[PDB]
Amino acid sequence: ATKAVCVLKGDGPVQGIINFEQKESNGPVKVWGSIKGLTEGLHGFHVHEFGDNTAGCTSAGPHFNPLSRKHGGPKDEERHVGDLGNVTADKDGVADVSIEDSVISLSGDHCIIGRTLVVHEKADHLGTGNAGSRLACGVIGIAQ
Amino acid sequence: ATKAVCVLKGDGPVQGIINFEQKESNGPVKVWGSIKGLTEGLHGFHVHEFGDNTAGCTSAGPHFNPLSRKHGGPKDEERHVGDLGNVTADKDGVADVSIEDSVISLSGDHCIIGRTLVVHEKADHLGKKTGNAGSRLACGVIGIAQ
Ligand SMILES: [Zn+2]
Ligand SMILES: [Zn+2]
Ligand SMILES: [Zn+2]
Ligand SMILES: [Zn+2]
Numbered sequence: 001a002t003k004a005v006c007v008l009k010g011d012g013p014v015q016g017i018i019n020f021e022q023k024e025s026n027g028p029v030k031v032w033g034s035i036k037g038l039t040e041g042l043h044g045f046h047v048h049e050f051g052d053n054t055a056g057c058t059s060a061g062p063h064f065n066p067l068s069r070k071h072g073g074p075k076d077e078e079r080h081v082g083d084l085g086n087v088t089a090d091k092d093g094v095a096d097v098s099i100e101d102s103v104i105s106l107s108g109d110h111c112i113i114g115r116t117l118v119v120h121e122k123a124d125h126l127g128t129g130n131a132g133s134r135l136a137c138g139v140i141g142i143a144q
Numbered sequence: 145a146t147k148a149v150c151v152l153k154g155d156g157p158v159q160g161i162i163n164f165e166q167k168e169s170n171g172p173v174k175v176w177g178s179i180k181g182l183t184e185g186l187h188g189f190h191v192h193e194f195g196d197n198t199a200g201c202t203s204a205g206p207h208f209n210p211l212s213r214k215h216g217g218p219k220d221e222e223r224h225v226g227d228l229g230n231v232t233a234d235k236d237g238v239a240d241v242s243i244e245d246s247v248i249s250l251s252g253d254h255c256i257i258g259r260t261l262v263v264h265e266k267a268d269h270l271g272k273k274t275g276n277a278g279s280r281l282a283c284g285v286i287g288i289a290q
Contacts, residue, residue, distance in 0.1 A: 004258070005196050017198055031153070050288015053151045054161055061290060113195075114148070114257035114288040139285035141195020142258040144205060 002106040005143040006117045010136035011056060013037030018097060018117055022106040029105060029144070031084070033138070035119055038089035044120030044131025045097075047082030047104060047140070049113040057134035060116035066109055073126030074101055081110050086124050095119075114141050116128045145250040149262045149289040154282035157181030162241060162261060164286070166250040173250060175228070176242040178248070179263055179282070182233035188264030188277025189241075191226030191248060195212065195258040201280035204260035207273075210253055217270030218245055225254050227275075230268050239263075257286050 004020035016035030022028070035043075048060035063071065064082030072079035081103050089094040105110050117140055121132030147166040160179030166172070179187075192204035207215065208226035216223030225247050230241040248256050265278030 005198060007197050022166050049288075052149050052284065052289045053284075053287065054149060065170040114145070114286065124167065138257065139195065140196075141197070141260065141285040142193075143196045144194050 003143040004106050004113055004140050006140045007029070008035060008117060008119055008136040008138045012135060014119060015066045015138040016095070016136070019143070020106060025107065026105060028100050028102050030100055035095045035117035036093055038095055038119070038135070040091050040093065042081060042086040042088055042123035043095065044122065044124035044129055045084045045087045045111045046118045046120065046131070047084065048104040048116045048118050048137070049082070051116050051139040053116070053137070057116070057118055060118060060134070060137055061127060064112060064115055071128035073124070074086050074099070074103070076132065078125060078127070079103065082112070085126065087119060111139060113142060115140055121130070145257060145288050146286055147289040148250050148257055148286050150284040152179060152261060152282040154262060154280070154286045158263060158282040160239070160282070163289070164250060169251050172244045172246040173248050174244050179231060179233070179239040180237055182237045182239055184233055184235050184237065185238065186230040186232055186267035188266065188268035188275055189228040189231045190262045190264070190268070191228065191256045192210060192260045192262050192283070195260050195285035197260065197283065197285060201238045201260070201262055201283035204221055204262060204283060208256060208259055213274050215271055217268070220271060222271065223247065225256070229270065231263065239245065253258055253280070260284065261286055
C-alpha cells in the first residue's frame with residue numbers, strides 16, 4: 001500500500017488536498033479529498049507531466065501521456081494516463097472527490113509521483129478536452 | 145528521470161528554486177539554484193521523507209533514510225540519503241547553491257522525487273539524529289522537470 005498526497009494551490013480562491021492510496025502493486029488507486037472555491041459545476045481534473053511549479057501551473061506541461069494516446073475520459077480506452085475526467089463542485093463551490101482509477105499508478109511507467117495534479121476552469125469534454133485555465137495545482141508527493 | 149526541480153516556500157521571507165540533474169542513472173546528481181531571504185551564515189539543507197506539505201514543512205517527516213544509516217554530512221560515508229549538509233547565505237541573505245551529490249538519486253531506491261527539500265533556520269551539525277538545524281524555514285516537493 002503506497003500513499004501520495006497533493007496540495008492544490010493557485011493565484012485565485014481554488015485550493016484543496018487530494019490523497020492517493022494504492023493498497024497493492026499496480027493495483028487500483030483510490031483518489032479522494034476536497035477542493036474548494038470552485039464555481040458550481042464540473043471541472044477538468046488532470047495529471048500533467050511535470051512537477052515543475054516554477055511558473056505556477058503553467059510549467060506543468062501537457063497531460064501525462066507516456067503512451068502517446070489521444071485525450072479522453074477516465075473510462076476511455078483511448079486516453080492519457082493523466083485523464084481523470086471531472087470533479088463536481090456543489091452549490092457552495094466544494095468538490096468532494098472520491099474515485100478509483102486503474103490507469104494511474106504510484107509505481108512504474110504509469111507513475112504519477114513527482115508530477116502535477118491540476119484542477120481546471122471548465123468541464124473536460126472528455127474527447128485538450130477544452131477544460132480552460134489551470135486554476136490550482138500541486139506536485140504529487142509521497143505520503144506516510 | 146534525468147531532471148527535477150523544487151520551489152521552496154514557507155511562511156516567512158525564505159524562498160528559492162533548486163534544480164537537479166542526473167546524466168546517468170548510476171551517477172551523481174548536480175544540485176543548483178538560489179535561496180533568498182536567509183540570515184547570513186549556514187543553513188541546514190535536507191531531503192525529508194514525505195512530499196506532504198499539507199501541514200507545511202512539518203508533514204514532511206524525518207530525514208529521508210531508506211538505507212537505515214545515521215545522520216551525517218554529505219561527504220561522510222555514514223549519512224542519510226537526505227543529508228545535503230548546509231547552504232551558505234551571504235550578507236544579503238542569498239545562498240547560491242551548486243554542488244554534486246552521489247547518494248541522492250532521481251530514480252531507484254535512493255530516489256528523492258516526490259519527497260520534500262527543506263532549508264533550515266540554522267546550521268546542521270553534520271553528525272558532530274537530525275543535526276539540530278532548528279526550524280524548517282522553507283520547503284517544497286521535488287518534482288520531475290522537462
Ligand atoms: Zn489539464
Ligand atoms: Zn488528456
Ligand atoms: Zn531537516
Ligand atoms: Zn540526516
